[PDB]
Each structure stands twice: as C-alpha cells, then as structure tokens.
C-alpha cells in the first residue's frame, strides 16, 4: 500500500519525467533552491542553519542544495526495491541524527516541499503517489528525530 510498485514507478517516472532527456544537466539548482525556499516557508526552519546559510547565490549553499536533491534522487530512484531503500534511508537518518536542529515534523516538511515543486514544474505529477512515497522516505530519514 504505502507507496506501492506502481506508485513508486510513477514517482520515479515523473521525478525523472522532470529531470528528462533535455533538462537534468544544468539547473537542478533552480529546482533545488525552489525546494529550499518552499522548505523554509512551510517548515519555518531557519536558513541560517545550512552551509552558506541559505543565500541562493552562496557557492557553498548551492553545493549543499545539490547534495540534498541528489540524496532525494538516490532514494526516489530506488523505491521499487524495498530492501535497499530502507538501508539508503537509514544511512540518511544517521547523518541527520548527528545534527542538532532536525525534527521529525521538519523532515516531512522538506520532503513535502520536493513533491510540491515537482508538481509546479511537472503539472501532471501524480500528487497522490508522490505524497504517499515521499511520506515513506520521510520516515527513514526522520526515524526517531
């Protein structure tokens, strides 16, 4: 149920469908900041907490954003395979357990922000599945935070 074979398939489709054969290779950053901005608003969290401290034009923060988007990409792209997804998330978990400032309710915030921006960009985006799956990803990362 919670993000099944077809759901993921669709998400992984759409997610790529966004990073398609014409895009993925230029402005993941445009998408990325767009993400972080919707993050900072919903979550309320302070940008004064990341490398470069937000600032869409800070060389550090960009790298940061890229690094975040890619994490989400590694996971999204591997939802079809349960076993290895749990792992990938668990590891992400550990990385965040190690940082004072992360909350369970906050991860979901950032997780929901992805889905959203994904849909602004790709209007078709099956928002029911995206939330279904991103909700799952939200668990593995915020496990116990």
């Amino acid at each position: 149920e919670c993000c099944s074979r077809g759901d993921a398939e669709v998400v992984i489709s759409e997610w790529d469908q966004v990073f398609n054969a014409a895009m993925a290779g230029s402005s993941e950053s445009a998408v990325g900041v767009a993400i972080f901005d919707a993050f900072f608003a919903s979550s309320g969290v302070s940008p004064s907490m990341f490398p470069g401290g937000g600032d869409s034009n800070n060389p550090e923060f960009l790298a940061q954003v890229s690094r975040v988007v890619s994490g989400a990409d590694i996971a999204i792209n591997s939802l079809t395979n349960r076993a290895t997804c749990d792992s990938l998330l668990s590891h992400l978990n550990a990385q965040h357990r190690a940082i004072s400032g992360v909350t369970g309710a906050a991860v979901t915030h950032l997780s929901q922000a992805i889905s959203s921006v994904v849909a602004q960009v790709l209007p078709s985006a099956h928002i029911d599945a995206w939330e279904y799956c991103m909700a799952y990803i939200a668990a593995g990362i915020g496990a116990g935070l």
């Binding site: 290779g25 490398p51 060389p59 590694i74 591997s78 290895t84 990938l88």
Partner: protein
C-alpha cells in the same frame, strides 16, 4: 583539467550511460565490482558497508551513493565554484579512511571500463580529464 567542451562530451555520455541504463543498482554494483577486480586491496577497504556481500541491501545502498554523488558532480562540472565546494565537502568524507593515490587512479579505471560498454560512442581522453578533475578535488 576537464575543459568546457570535454565537459560536454562527458556530461552527455554519462547520462547516455548511467542515465539510460536499466537499474542503476546493477551498474553501481557493477562498478565497485571492478574497483575490486582491478585492485583487491580496496575490497577490504569498505569493511564498514557489508562489502562481504555485494548483493546486500547494505552494500548496494553504498554503490548508489557513489554513482549517485558521482552524478551530483558531473552535473555541476560547469559550475566551477559550486563543484569545488561540493568536491571539498567530499574530500573530507574520505579523510578518515587511508587512501593512496593508487586507489583513485584505480577507481577511475573501474569507471572507465564500466561506462564505454554501455555506449555507442565514448571519448577516452575527454573522460580521463574530468575523472581527473574530480579525483583531485576528492583527494588533494
């Protein structure tokens, strides 16, 4: 090292390969497979990530992070300031494990032996330059 144009070739060929390919997890394990097959000394070097069993959740989960990060880099290749930072972040994530310059030179051997099989066209040099441009940033 990896110039403006040599970047292009690669950026596309990587997508054309890692991109198009079926299930990355294969490709990913596939890569580390070599790294080991071209330098066994390293195989044990990943003792903390279920390297014992290359078909494990734990292990594959790693290979991904790599072909993954390895992705978040080729994409940023044009962004000098961004990729350097990212590259720096990466370097200090390899500071703990003792790595010689025969591992990085080995890694890029594994990469450059995996990739061309998945393409119709692949530029040896153009790749070396960028694998280089990347290896450096991640080591010293």
């Amino acid at each position: 090292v990896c110039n403006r144009l040599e970047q292009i070739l690669v950026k596309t060929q990587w997508a054309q390969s890692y991109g198009e390919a079926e299930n990355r997890a294969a490709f990913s394990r596939d890569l580390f497979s070599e790294l080991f097959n071209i330098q066994g000394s390293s195989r044990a070097l990943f003792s903390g990530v279920g390297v014992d069993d290359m078909n494990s959740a734990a292990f594959t989960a790693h290979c991904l992070r790599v072909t993954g990060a390895l992705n978040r880099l080729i994409s940023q290749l044009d962004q000098q300031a961004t990729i350097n930072a990212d590259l720096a972040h990466l370097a200090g994530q390899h500071a703990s494990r003792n790595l010689d310059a025969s591992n990085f030179a080995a890694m890029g051997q594994a990469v450059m032996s995996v990739v061309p099989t998945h393409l119709d066209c692949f530029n040896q040099h153009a790749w070396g330059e960028c694998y280089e441009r990347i290896a450096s940033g991640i080591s010293g």
